[model samples]
Target: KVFGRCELAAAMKRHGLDNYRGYSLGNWVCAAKFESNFNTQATNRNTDGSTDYGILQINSRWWCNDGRTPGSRNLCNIPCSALLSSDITASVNCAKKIVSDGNGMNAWVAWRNRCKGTDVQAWIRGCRL
Candidate 1:
């Protein structure tokens, strides 16, 4: 487990994820909030029988490697375990691709349910950076 809300927001900014996926830091922070509570190693089982991996909970349905565990075209190129690490590199990259696919934060259920129509500012508020 790592990163609180503000910390993740700042890290996202430092990592260029403030708007990296063409989505606001608020959306990113919001999604991360529900998806994994900012834990980089967070993982879950989807109702569809797929697995969600990492802080942003990138799905194995079509984003990351699930082979031997799996794959949905491996959109991020690296194995999903590569996402469950101290590094946010692969996770952020996949998020960019997912957003660039045109769904925006809608691709993340957490973003839709928790981030949409919200003030979306506390995600970036009061952090010293």
Candidate 2:
């Protein structure tokens, strides 16, 4: 796991999640919990045959290439494998662009279904950040 709750909060504080447009650190924390449990290497196959990558679980169709198929946008200009690394610099950078669309957390279904409209404070309740 690249970020335990406390670590993620610290990163958020230091990284200035200032890039986040109205998206709270608590909400991002909650999304990470539901999306990948903070595990950088996590990956899941979607019902549509596209894949979600890394702790952010970025979609293959719009953000990355899984190599077996051509992604629609390749917005990150990166291979899916890059996101699986323990270092999250690239994934975080890509995520910033994703949420930049004014969709906020809507781009991530995990955030929509699980973290959205939820209290979400628990995601960082005990963090020392």
Candidate 3:
């Protein structure tokens, strides 16, 4: 099922996302596939022992304070469950911003070129709306 809802198709259409028919879903699936394999509860330790959390593989240590409610932790300021709930579109959009802003994806036409065969990065690039 697509994000646990058949209505995602209707939602997409209502949002004027006809171009997304097959392509955009594939991109989201690819990003979710490579980033955290669509695991909403995934977490990982970086080389520095910092923690990255949630489906988008967002680094919570860098973005959120621990021992707080996901909402109290500033969903926009930090990585949390809000990104994993029904608001995954926001999560994906945030990922695109992070990749573009942090890596100059907007300035660099070669961003996708650089990530060519690297599955995760490539998926992120490929998923751009």
Candidate 4:
């Protein structure tokens, strides 16, 4: 399912997108798909244990108080176990906040810039569920 449906819905509501219409939902899904393949448990670790986690793959250090420690607060200040128990809407909201802050869909822009000569819309449309 889409990560953190409730939190995301709430965030979208704050932005006047309570219904998730038009390009907003499309763009939100595109962001998640582009970032982490929609996998909430996904994690990538460095040899030192510093890691990225969840669907948005937020850098643990960036959001986690205990990123340097195994038991430290990770996603949303909750422990990893509690964090993983639900969909990753908080993380997606974090990403959405970044995008809404005038970054112009930074992840999507990065994908488009990296995939130069490719049809970006077609790429995103391919991700439509």
Candidate 5:
């Protein structure tokens, strides 16, 4: 699913991402914008052979099991393919685990590079939520 800004905001909040781990909804919205442009099926292959999957781009190296990334811990204990669907339930839950694991939002380079230290609230400014 390629979501509109407000649509993604509602989804994220509905899935318990709002203010999760001290990160605001805006922060998540901003991260999602940069990470996958709100695309559920987005995937990126890293130079290290790991892959990022879904809107939040949870990685295979440590989070999801892709059966490809060498020695992937599968900390989230979910198949990488699960992250590609429109449901986003698995992806959101895994993301929460990632943050709760103490990586915070630093796990996503897109968040660090773009969402961090910015007016991320603007990402959802026009939203009806």
Candidate 6:
């Protein structure tokens, strides 16, 4: 499912993504836009043979077990497939875990390249928190 921007923000806020790890809801919202365009079923294959899955694009190499990426730590302790669901609860939980694990929001390169060091507030402007 592809979410409208405000819908995505509201949904993410429900999952406690607002101001998670000192990153605003806007950062998460903007990262989702760049990472998967708010599409729940998004996937991207990495050059190292790992794959990123879901709206947040959690990586299989370290975050989740995909049964394909060798030596996967699966730190999120959930199946990669879980991240692809429209519910987003699992992915949001894993995202928190990832950030708390010390990677911060930079765990997603899309966040670094696009959402970071920018006026993230713009992403959530006009959305009712």
Which stretches of candidate 3 lie above 4 Å from their native place? Answer: 1-25, 61-76, 102-115, 118-129
lDDT of 1 by residue, 18-113 (tens): 766467788888888899988999999877777999999998878887774343577677788888887787888788888888778888888898
Q: What is the Cα-based lDDT of residue 70 in candidate 6?
A: 91
Which pairs of residues collide in model 4?
4-89
- Encode model 6's per-residue lDDT on 1-129: one tens digit a residue: 999999999999999999888888999999999999999999999999999999999999998999999977898899999999989999999999988977798788999998888999988899987
Q: Is candidate 2 or candidate 4 better by lDDT?
A: 2
lDDT of each: 0.81, 0.82, 0.45, 0.48, 0.92, 0.92
Is 1 or 2 the stronger prediction by TM-score?
A: 1
Span of 10 residues, lowest total lDDT, candidate 1: 66-75
Q: Estimate each model's TM-score.
A: 0.90, 0.89, 0.47, 0.49, 0.96, 0.96
- Top-down lDDT ranking: 6, 5, 2, 1, 4, 3
lDDT (10s digit) by residue, model 3, range 8-116 = 3333334443333223433344444445555666666666555555545665544444444333333346445555555455455555545544443222223244433
TM-score of model 5 (CA atoms): 0.96
Worst 10 residues of 2 by lDDT: 10-19
Clashes of 1: 2
- After superposing candidate 4 on the true structure, give the runs of residues whose Cα lies further than 4 Å from its correct spot: 1-23, 46-49, 69-83, 100-104, 107-129
lDDT tens string, model 5, 1-129? 899999989989999898999999999999889999999999999999999999999989989999899977899889999999989899899999988887799988999998899999998898987
Off by over 4 Å in 2: none
Q: Give candidate 1 misplaced runs (Cα > 4 Å).
A: 68-71
lDDT of 4 by residue, 1-129 (tens): 445434443443455532232334444544545555665666677465766656555555545543365654443564433334344556545554444545445435433444334443443343312
Q: After superposition, how far is residue 100 of candidate 3 from its true place, in Å?
A: 2.3
Off by over 4 Å in 5: none
RMSD vs true structure, all candidates: 1.7, 1.7, 7.9, 6.6, 0.9, 0.9
Best by lDDT: 6
